[PDB]
């Protein structure tokens, strides 16, 4: 069952109209002694907020925390998903220890930085997907066909999602519509012995987050229960890749998905793939095309563009290799990339 297929990967991110770039992306391909030096491929999009520090920390450390966990190289998927979940948690817990080193807010309080994190890990014919937040992951599947259908395989962790609101209200928080957007409302401040700032002023400085799960956001720690109101535990899923039917995996931040719906995005990739081999080295990758398309829609709607990021993975049943901004991967050939 050790199947042969190829991937072609592109990635692009743009700051949009924001003053800082807090989106990050990551791609790591490395041989696994487990799969007899067949390579595992890790892809991630992290949409940071409250400062770039958390997203940058996940960029540098999330994959290492994941692949260290017991059961990660197990052949049983339930154990792989369990290891991936533990790696998210370990990365979150490592940020807590880093918090003193991250820059203070403009009022002198500890950093409020946090980040969504969406991860795709391909090993063999299996695709593991883990996420916290709203940087969605979309598959394209061809059922032959000249139409590729989008499938959304992650659900955004919005505060008003019922499972999330239940968890938040159970810790003593609330979910409130603030200016048309539902937000987590937490009023329990992080109090110290040596800190100067007034407690009532700490309370007013607590963020109102638009996601209910993230890595970081350590202000959400609940001293009473020991839980974090903004949860670092990801949803996990496993899918069997069928190179005859699966054609695309898109990971993206909400800068992309707020402008470009899943089917629009998958149908655009299907159109760009034709063009990409007519412009050759100098056409836009699918990822670059998606980001620029979203930026065009932000502008056309007269809105400041968010940070916008995408990773597009094209799946091919062939294993025979011209776009300079695309990485070709055959995982049974032990490629190494950024590793």
Binding site for Mg ion (CB under 5 A): 22, 47, 49, 253-255, 306
What are the CB-based long-range contacts (under 8 Å, 24+) for 197-203? 197/107, 197/108, 197/109, 201/107, 202/109
Asked whether residue 50 is marked as a ligand-binding residue, the answer is: no
Closest approach of Mg ion to the CB of residue 49, in Å: 5
Q: Looking at beta carbons only, is 24 or 150 nearer to Mg ion?
A: 24
- C-alpha–C-alpha distance, residues 326 and 41, integer Å: 15
Closest approach of Mg ion to the CB of residue 272, in Å: 23
Residue whose C-alpha is closest to residue 158's, from 179, 137, 181: 181
Q: Looking at beta carbons only, is 136 or 173 nearer to Mg ion?
A: 136
Burial of 223 (0-12, 13-18, 19+ CB in 10 A): exposed
Give the number of other Cβ atoms within 10 Å of residue 122's Cβ: 23
Q: Looking at beta carbons only, is 7 or 91 nearer to Mg ion?
A: 91
Q: Which residues pair with 47 in a beta bridge?
A: 23
Residue whose C-alpha is closest to residue 253's, from 94, 21, 9, 7: 21
Q: Helices 262-279 & 286-300, crossing angle to 10 degrees? A: 130
Asked whether residue 172 is marked as a ligand-binding residue, the answer is: no
- C-alpha–C-alpha distance, residues 175 and 166, integer Å: 10
Q: Looking at beta carbons only, is 272 or 307 nearer to Mg ion?
A: 307
Q: What angle do CA 277, 279, 285 make, to 5 degrees?
A: 70
Q: Which residues pair with 177 in a beta bridge?
A: 182
Q: Looking at beta carbons only, is 103 or 280 nearer to Mg ion?
A: 103
Closest approach of Mg ion to the CB of residue 274, in Å: 30
Asked whether residue 254 is marked as a ligand-binding residue, the answer is: yes
- C-alpha–C-alpha distance, residues 294 and 292, integer Å: 5
Closest approach of Mg ion to the CB of residue 260, in Å: 13
Q: Looking at beta carbons only, is 55 or 80 nearer to Mg ion?
A: 55
Closest approach of Mg ion to the CB of residue 47, in Å: 4
**The two three-digit tokens of residue 68, written as one number:** 């260290």
Asked whether residue 23 is marked as a ligand-binding residue, the answer is: no
What is the greatest pairwise CA distance in the chain? Answer: 67
Q: Torsions phi, psi of 220, nearest 5?
A: -85, -5
Closest approach of Mg ion to the CB of residue 50, in Å: 9
- Which helix (DSSP H) or strand (DSSP E) does residue 319 occupy? none
Closest approach of Mg ion to the CB of residue 250, in Å: 15
Q: What angle do CA 22, 28, 30 make, to 5 degrees?
A: 165
Q: Looking at beta carbons only, is 156 or 254 nearer to Mg ion?
A: 254
What residues form the annotated binding site? 47-48, 254, 306
What residues form the annotated binding site for Mn(2+)? 47-48, 254, 306
């Amino acid at each position: 069952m050790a199947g042969l297929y190829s991937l072609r990967v592109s990635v692009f991110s743009d700051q949009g109209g924001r003053k800082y770039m807090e989106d990050v992306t990551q791609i790591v391909v490395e041989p696994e002694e487990t799969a007899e030096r067949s390579s595992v491929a890790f892809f991630a999009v992290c949409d940071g907020h409250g400062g770039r520090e958390a997203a940058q920390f996940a960029r540098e450390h999330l994959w290492g925390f994941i692949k260290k966990q017991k059961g990660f190289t197990s052949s049983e998927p339930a154990k792989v998903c369990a290891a991936i979940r533990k790696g998210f948690l370990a990365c979150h817990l490592a940020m807590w220890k880093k918090l003193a080193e991250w820059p203070k807010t403009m009022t002198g309080l500890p950093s409020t930085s946090g980040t969504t994190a969406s991860v795709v890990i391909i090993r063999g014919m299996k695709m593991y997907v883990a996420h916290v937040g709203d940087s969605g992951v979309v598959l394209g599947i061809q059922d032959k066909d000249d139409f590729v259908r989008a499938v959304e395989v992650t659900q955004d962790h919005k505060p008003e999602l019922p499972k999330e609101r239940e968890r938040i209200e159970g810790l003593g928080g609330s979910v409130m519509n603030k200016s048309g957007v539902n937000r987590v409302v937490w009023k329990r401040p992080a109090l110290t012995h040596n800190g100067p700032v007034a407690a009532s002023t700490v309370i007013d400085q607590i963020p109102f987050l638009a996601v209910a799960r993230a890595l970081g956001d350590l202000w959400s720690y609940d001293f009473f229960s020991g839980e974090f109101v903004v949860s670092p535990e990801p949803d996990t899923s496993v899918h069997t890749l069928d190179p005859q039917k699966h054609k695309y995996i898109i990971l993206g931040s909400d800068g992309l998905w707020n402008m470009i719906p899943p089917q629009d995005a998958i149908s655009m990739c299907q159109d760009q793939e034709e063009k990409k081999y007519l412009m050759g080295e100098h056409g836009q990758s699918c990822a670059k095309m998606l980001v620029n398309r979203a930026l065009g829609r932000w502008r056309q709607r007269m809105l400041r563009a968010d940070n916008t990021s995408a990773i597009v993975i094209c799946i091919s049943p062939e294993v025979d290799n011209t776009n300079e901004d695309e990485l070709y991967l055959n995982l049974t050939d032990s490629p190494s990339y950024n590793s």
